[PDB]
Amino acid sequence: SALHWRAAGAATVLLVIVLLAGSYLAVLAERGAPGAQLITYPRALWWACETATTVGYXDLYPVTLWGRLVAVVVMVAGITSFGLVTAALATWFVGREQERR
Amino acid sequence: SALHWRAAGAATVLLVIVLLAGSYLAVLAERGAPGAQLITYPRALWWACETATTVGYXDLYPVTLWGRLVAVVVMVAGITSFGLVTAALATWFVGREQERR
Amino acid sequence: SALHWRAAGAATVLLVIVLLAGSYLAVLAERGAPGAQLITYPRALWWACETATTVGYXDLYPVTLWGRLVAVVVMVAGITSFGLVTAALATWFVGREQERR
Amino acid sequence: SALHWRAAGAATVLLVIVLLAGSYLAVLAERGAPGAQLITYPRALWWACETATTVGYXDLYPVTLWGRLVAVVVMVAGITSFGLVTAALATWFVGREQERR
Amino acid sequence: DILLTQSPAILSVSPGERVSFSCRASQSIGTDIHWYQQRTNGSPRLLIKYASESISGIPSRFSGSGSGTDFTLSINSVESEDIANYYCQQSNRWPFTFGSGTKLEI
Amino acid sequence: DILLTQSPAILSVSPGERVSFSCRASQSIGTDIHWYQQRTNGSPRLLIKYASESISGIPSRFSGSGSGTDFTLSINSVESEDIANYYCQQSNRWPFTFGSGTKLEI
Numbered sequence: 001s002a003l004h005w006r007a008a009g010a011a012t013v014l015l016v017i018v019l020l021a022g023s024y025l026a027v028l029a030e031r032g033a034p035g036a037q038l039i040t041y042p043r044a045l046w047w048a049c050e051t052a053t054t055v056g057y058x059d060l061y062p063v064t065l066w067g068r069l070v071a072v073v074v075m076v077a078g079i080t081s082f083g084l085v086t087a088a089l090a091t092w093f094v095g096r097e098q099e100r101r
Numbered sequence: 102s103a104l105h106w107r108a109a110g111a112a113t114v115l116l117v118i119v120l121l122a123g124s125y126l127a128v129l130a131e132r133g134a135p136g137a138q139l140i141t142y143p144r145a146l147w148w149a150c151e152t153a154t155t156v157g158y159x160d161l162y163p164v165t166l167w168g169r170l171v172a173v174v175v176m177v178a179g180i181t182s183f184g185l186v187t188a189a190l191a192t193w194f195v196g197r198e199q200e201r202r
Numbered sequence: 203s204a205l206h207w208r209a210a211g212a213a214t215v216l217l218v219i220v221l222l223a224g225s226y227l228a229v230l231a232e233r234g235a236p237g238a239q240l241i242t243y244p245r246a247l248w249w250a251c252e253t254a255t256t257v258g259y260x261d262l263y264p265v266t267l268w269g270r271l272v273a274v275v276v277m278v279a280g281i282t283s284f285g286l287v288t289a290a291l292a293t294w295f296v297g298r299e300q301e302r303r
Numbered sequence: 304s305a306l307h308w309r310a311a312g313a314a315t316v317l318l319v320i321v322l323l324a325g326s327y328l329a330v331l332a333e334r335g336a337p338g339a340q341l342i343t344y345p346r347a348l349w350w351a352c353e354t355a356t357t358v359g360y361x362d363l364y365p366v367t368l369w370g371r372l373v374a375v376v377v378m379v380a381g382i383t384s385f386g387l388v389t390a391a392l393a394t395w396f397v398g399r400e401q402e403r404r
Numbered sequence: 405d406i407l408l409t410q411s412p413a414i415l416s417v418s419p420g421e422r423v424s425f426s427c428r429a430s431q432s433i434g435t436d437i438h439w440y441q442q443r444t445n446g447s448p449r450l451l452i453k454y455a456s457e458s459i460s461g462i463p464s465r466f467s468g469s470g471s472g473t474d475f476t477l478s479i480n481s482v483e484s485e486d487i488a489n490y491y492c493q494q495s496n497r498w499p500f501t502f503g504s505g506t507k508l509e510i
Numbered sequence: 511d512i513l514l515t516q517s518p519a520i521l522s523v524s525p526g527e528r529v530s531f532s533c534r535a536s537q538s539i540g541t542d543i544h545w546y547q548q549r550t551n552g553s554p555r556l557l558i559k560y561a562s563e564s565i566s567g568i569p570s571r572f573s574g575s576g577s578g579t580d581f582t583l584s585i586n587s588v589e590s591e592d593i594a595n596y597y598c599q600q601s602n603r604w605p606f607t608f609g610s611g612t613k614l615e616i
């Protein structure tokens with residue numbers, strides 16, 4: 001269909017993928033660092049969600065270089081994804097409006 | 102009226118609904134988990150607000166699977182709602198501007 | 203000038219106003235609640251900034267009903283303001299682009 | 304090329320610059336304040352990233368006046384940058400869509 | 405889970421005097437502490453909520469204070485009807501728990 | 511790293527009685543504590559996970575509780591097959607660590 005809606009859907013699928021690889025790689029990055037808490041997968045996936053929506057309570061966060069790099073990727077992927085949706089909703093609204101007139 | 106403005110209003114009403122069901126379901130999800138703090142309704146509604154605006158101080162957050170799922174829904178509903186408003190403000194601005202010219 | 207740019211500027215001035223009244227009203231709301239930390243003005247203004255940009259480290263946050271209500275207003279004013287700017291940048295970009303073609 | 308895409312790229316380069324000067328100036332601002340933790344550069348750069356994406360876990364944050372001012376600049380630069388990208392994605396989507404029709 | 409310690413378990417005061425019951429939490433609970441009075445053969449009665457907020461129907465003589473881990477229930481000028489056991493209860497974290505109780509003796 | 515203290519190291523109870531093993535963490539670990547049983551010459555056996563969650567194949571007699579720094583593994587009406595050593599293990603922070611062990615004697 002319309003490009004904007006395809007880019008949106010694509011971004012959402014990709015986000016779900018970044019959340020899962022992000023959870024996997026965070027645990028992999030953080031185990032081995034004394035004091036780290038981002039070390040079991042169920043809570044890491046939750047950590048990935050709250051990082052992507054940029055909510056960041058946090059209750060958990062990375063302390064190593066690679067966990068932080070993985071964190072930045074999750075952030076960016078979520079901020080970009082949510083931004084692509086807004087943008088598509090604007091495209092849709094601009095079109096229907098030019099019609100309503 | 103204009104579709105964009107209707108989608109906005111609709112999203113706002115829906116957000117208020119997600120904040121209230123979200124507060125109710127968070128307490129329901131979290132009571133029963135030792136150490137949980139998202140367990141009385143007034144503070145849960147406040148928790149719901151700060152999660153939807155993605156501010157996340159956090160001072161409170163869910164520790165169970167269902168409280169976290171409820172958290173993700175509140176996040177998404179708020180991010181989508183605020184995004185729908187931006188998008189409608191863009192639609193409105195694009196139209197008046199094409200006129201000013 | 204263009205409506206979008208005026209709404210933006212207006213939103214920015216209004217935000218600066220909400221940050222200052224917000225700092226004042228937060229201290230007023232929170233003094234009187236045992237344990238509260240949002241009680242001197244310089245740190246409350248900083249709290250107001252980090253709430254409006256939705257960064258929320260959190261290092262400080264309201265614990266009373268009125269401080270939280272004041273918090274929600276600051277959040278919304280900042281999210282709306284930053285959203286109005288994005289929207290104006292889109293309006294500007296849409297126009298110059300239709301020209302470049 | 305298109306103005307929107309140039310403004311985006313420009314904002315991204317500028318953000319990378321604000322993140323690096325921001326890390327440098329935060330350490331400079333915070334050393335000298337008893338209890339401050341934003342005092343070595345690797346963690347300050349990470350702090351700068353999580354502030355710009357507005358994630359704010361938080362694990363670290365400024366406690367001085369100048370560190371906070373530097374914090375506000377990083378916030379604003381990131382919020383503006385990410386907003387400029389959304390806006391450019393909307394411009395791109397609006398154009399291709401008017402074509403698809 | 406949160407341990408609430410009430411000590412001493414028995415407090416003896418002279419008619420009309422100022423009495424203070426203490427409740428100490430094992431970890432910080434903001435102001436999420438509530439006080440109850442249970443007279444001999446009676447059911448518990450809420451006296452103060454959220455550490456310092458008054459309840460309707462309770463004599464003005466009763467007051468509460470504290471935040472964090474240390475809490476006090478105070479009685480200004482105690483009288484005979486105040487003879488009872490007094491309990492604190494926290495709602496900050498699941499599950500809710502009760503302190504072991506302080507008896508007021510005159 | 512997280513120190514898990516199990517005390518006393520030896521617990522003696524009468525057949526059928528209620529027994530409670532204690533595990534205290536050096537800092538707060540939510541409910542990230544797990545319990546194992548290791549009989550003489552045997553390999554450890556998971557009894558309870560996340561402080562209070564039951565495992566399949568383990569008698570209902572076994573239960574756990576606690577959150578934060580203090581944890582208890584309880585046995586309702588102990589019997590002979592329960593004679594063993596009992597260990598707690600935390601997974602809240604890296605690296606995982608084990609408590610020193612409590613022996614059950616009847």
Ligand SMILES: CCCCCCCCC(=O)OC[C@H](CO)OC(=O)CCC
Pocket residue numbers: 063064065066068069072345346348349352
């Ligand atoms: C996208 C931005 C990601 C920023 C990640 C920062 C990680 C800081 C760190 O832990 O780095 C730890 C190491 C030392 O162990 O510091 C270094 O020498 C690395 C230079 C950055």
Ligand SMILES: CCCCCCCCC(=O)OC[C@H](CO)OC(=O)CCC
Pocket residue numbers: 042043045046049164165166167169170173
């Ligand atoms: C929209 C994304 C929501 C993510 C929610 C993650 C909750 C993690 C959790 O507490 O899960 C707890 C349970 C164990 O009690 O882990 C599991 O086996 C469930 C698999 C996810």
Ligand SMILES: CCCCCCCCC(=O)OC[C@H](CO)OC(=O)CCC
Pocket residue numbers: 143144146147150265266267268270271274
């Ligand atoms: C825009 C949304 C703002 C939400 C603010 C929630 C404040 C909760 C609170 O502290 O409320 C404290 C009081 C009791 O002191 O609870 C009540 O009976 C008030 C009902 C909400």
Ligand SMILES: CCCCCCCCC(=O)OC[C@H](CO)OC(=O)CCC
Pocket residue numbers: 244245247248251366367368369371372375
């Ligand atoms: C863009 C907004 C930035 C806000 C920064 C607030 C810093 C507060 C502070 O630490 O200020 C500390 C000083 C005292 O050391 O307070 C003052 O007299 C300064 C007046 C603001």
Ligand SMILES: [Rb+]
Pocket residue numbers: 053054055154155156255256257356357358
């Ligand atoms: Rb945010």
Ligand SMILES: [Rb+]
Pocket residue numbers: 054055056155156157256257258357358359
């Ligand atoms: Rb945040």
Ligand SMILES: [Rb+]
Pocket residue numbers: 055056057156157158257258259358359360
């Ligand atoms: Rb946060």
Ligand SMILES: [Rb+]
Pocket residue numbers: 057058059158159160259260261360361362
């Ligand atoms: Rb936090």
Ligand SMILES: [Rb+]
Pocket residue numbers: none
């Ligand atoms: Rb945003």
